[model samples]
Target: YLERELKKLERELKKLSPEELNRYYASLRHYLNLVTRQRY
Candidate 1:
């Protein structure tokens, strides 16, 4: 389920415009880090 969620999140992120990506990039990466760390 975590992988499924990560995939959906990545798809949404890929749809973001450059400006939006810049704005949310840090938070997104941080969230990804937490998710991935928890998996390990």
Candidate 2:
């Protein structure tokens, strides 16, 4: 289910242009996303 959700979002990202997206969050700043649940 997580894989499907990941694909869903990446596909959402896919709708954007090269400059419109990145690895996650802001690619322009070299950002990588962390699961908020891990903050616990």
Candidate 3:
């Protein structure tokens, strides 16, 4: 389920403009940080 969600996100990211991709990457990083912090 998570992999499917991530693949879908990646597909959407591919459709975005450069500026949008940058914002998406930043958001992805933020989400990853939050998940990691919650695990520890």
Candidate 4:
């Protein structure tokens, strides 16, 4: 189930426009920073 969800997330990410992908990646980085105290 986790693998399926990850694959679905990857597919959705691939469908994003370049700008949207950038924003998504930024948010992902922010989330990682929040959890790991590291910046991208």
Candidate 5:
């Protein structure tokens, strides 16, 4: 389910403007760091 949603979001991201895409991915990277820290 998560994988499916990830793909769906990726498609959505593809349609975003380059500036918005940069901002979106910047936030995602922070979330990844937080998630990784919690997991460990």
Candidate 6:
């Protein structure tokens, strides 16, 4: 299920333009950092 969820997300993300993909990836990393800090 976890891998399936990622596949779905990847499908949508791949549809994004290259520039949009880079910006979205950065945003996702920022969000991940916030959560990781709290958990860590």
Question: Could you say which candidate leads in TM-score?
Answer: 5
Candidate 6 accuracy as TM-score: 0.42
Q: TM-score for all predictions?
A: 0.37, 0.34, 0.40, 0.41, 0.44, 0.42
In the range 1-40, model 6's lDDT, one tens digit per residue, is 5998998898887886868878888989998889788876
Q: Candidate 6, residue 28: CA error in Å?
A: 0.7
Candidate 3 C-alpha lDDT tens digits along 1-40: 5988998887887786868768888988988888788776
TM-score, candidate 4, is 0.41
All predictions: root-mean-square deviation over Cα?
8.2, 6.7, 6.2, 5.8, 5.7, 4.8
Q: By lDDT, is 1 or 6 better?
A: 6
Error of 2 at 16 (Å): 0.7
- Per-model tally of clashing residue pairs: 0, 0, 0, 0, 0, 0
lDDT of 5 by residue, 1-40 (tens): 5998998887887786868878988899998888878886
Model 4 scores worst on lDDT over the 10 consecutive residues at 31-40
The lDDT for every candidate, in the order shown, is: 0.80, 0.59, 0.82, 0.79, 0.84, 0.84
Q: List the lowest-lDDT window of 10 residues for candidate 2.
A: 28-37
Model 6 misplacement above 4 A: 1-15
**Cα RMSD of predicted structure 2:** 6.7
Consecutive 10-residue window with the lowest summed lDDT within model 5: 13-22
By descending TM-score, how would the candidates be arranged? 5, 6, 4, 3, 1, 2
* Candidate 5 stretches greater than 4 Å from native: 1-15, 38-40
What is the C-alpha lDDT profile of model 2 across 1-40, one tens digit per residue? 5987998887786787756454443753432235443543
Q: How many times do residue backbones clash in model 6?
A: 0
Write the number of the candidate with greater TM-score, choosing between 1 and 3. Answer: 3
Alpha carbon deviation, residue 12, candidate 3 (Å): 15
Better of 2 and 3 by lDDT: 3
Model 5 residue 4 CA deviation (Å) reads 28
